[PDB]
Amino acid sequence: TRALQRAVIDKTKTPIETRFYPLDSLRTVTPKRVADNGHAVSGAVRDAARRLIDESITAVGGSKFEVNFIVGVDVDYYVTEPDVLLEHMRPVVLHTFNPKKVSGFDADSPFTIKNNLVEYKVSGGAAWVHPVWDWCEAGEFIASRVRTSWKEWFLQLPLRMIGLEKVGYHKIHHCRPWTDCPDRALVYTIPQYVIWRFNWIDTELHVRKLKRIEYQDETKPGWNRLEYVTDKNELLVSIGREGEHAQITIEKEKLDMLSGLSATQSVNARLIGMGHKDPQYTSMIVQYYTGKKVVSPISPTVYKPTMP
């Protein structure tokens, strides 16, 4: 339709490069394990991440605006949405929690997923109940709003009535540098420019807006599903019952071949055929196949004291 050419003519692009030296020191960095042996601790990993970002920002020569340029470490709860951070159209670096497992032990703090929110319970610190804003999905371009004063809001009121909006663009990268804590990632951002967008027109580049993830599977109520990519170009799937500890990692191919079976006995026979003998694995696979729903109870928990 002519709307495409209309929008294309309506470019209104104002790219800005405020001497934002690329943080190549942060980019293309070899993953490292913080802990000497055993496993690390949330404090240790946080300290290592802070040291890394601090030395990077010192090398680049720029400044930062630390929140308890823009830098944030394990502040998913403190930040209601990433849009508030992105609206400034400044470089942003995050040390977030984007797990590749539905549940289990995160670093040294166990975690589980109830509904679409993460029931995170740090070993040392307040328990966190926040969602995840779809950071590591495919795509490098994101759409976000821009800070505007209430006076500018009134000025645009007549202009936004039609459906015009001021949208900023950014470029994305993360690293996942810690092997002992794969559930955590080091997000990296770079703003590009700002334009005006019509609400009722599509975009070529399929730019997406960060959204809350929907872990729950509509086909398997009471269960949470997730899948990720592996070093060896393998597509693994992590599944587990919502708000509960158990989880399992399996290749999506085997899960696919299993899902269409008719008899649980056939499922068990096929599992036996592949050499999988661990009951903790086959039993969970069968449970997911049959979609068994169980009302997991809420019980008090006794954690450790932090050993600084």
């Binding site: 300290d47 040291r51 030395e55 010192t58 090398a59 020569g61």
Partner: protein, 333 residues
Amino acid sequence: VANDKKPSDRIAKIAETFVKLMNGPFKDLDPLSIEETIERLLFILKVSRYTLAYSDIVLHAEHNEHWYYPGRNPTEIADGVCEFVSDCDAEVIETDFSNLDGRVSSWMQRNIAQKAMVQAFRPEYRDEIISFMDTIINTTPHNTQYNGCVEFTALTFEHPDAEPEDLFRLIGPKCGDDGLSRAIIQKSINRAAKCFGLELKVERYNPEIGLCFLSRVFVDPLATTTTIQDPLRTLRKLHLTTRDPTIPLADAACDRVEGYLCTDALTPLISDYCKMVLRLYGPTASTEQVRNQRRSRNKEHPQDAHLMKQVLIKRTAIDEDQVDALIGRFAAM
């Protein structure tokens, strides 16, 4: 041999404190013009234009003269060495690094030298200096910065309860691959080098064999400042000439002996060799103006003469009667 041995978490604060103490009161700086850099003292020029100015401004300041000896005349070097040995009462230690430029790690390079240069220079020149450092990663000031960082680390490990400024105020003379330090951290220096990932060689000061510093031997630093070329390094190799084949042997030998006279005129077991070279290769050599107009020309206290003789004998572990026999053999040839 590139290395990527990042230091520990604790050492980072020590390195940052050392960098800040190096910064001192010189917050802002400006680059030098190309003409000024050229008349100061391709590929060398582009880095020199900034590094020479940075050294002259920060490393040659009032509060950074305690450690940055590199950058002064040999008479000044001798005066500084004698003052330092008098202060330490002949209790000093020597550091000898092996391929420091080939062993400094990426973390050290990007957290000492790059940080110092960026803090010293103006913000508007950040991109150029950072690009030059990135090109370097993939000359003289780097070695001095590494030596200062290692000295600061040793001082921090020795006295962790003192203030960083007071700790750094005790930094002794340092010049590239060579430097001086207190003997009380002789054993702890190895652990600091291991933490950073560097290899360190240390030797206790011994008056019997003299003190080694900048390939210079102090015969008796307690009283006299008389100094000579290092005998251990040069005696075993002075008989062989490493000049390029295109130069005649006579011209290279003449230049070598002229330099030796300029630096080691009254040193035993070297003056005789120099005089015999001048006697043999001298007349057979070409014109000295010809070698002064030739590129390869630059490619090379009487009161304590007894003490210098004995110190050289101790350095070379040669008996006095054997020394006299060698001197007689050299002169009569």
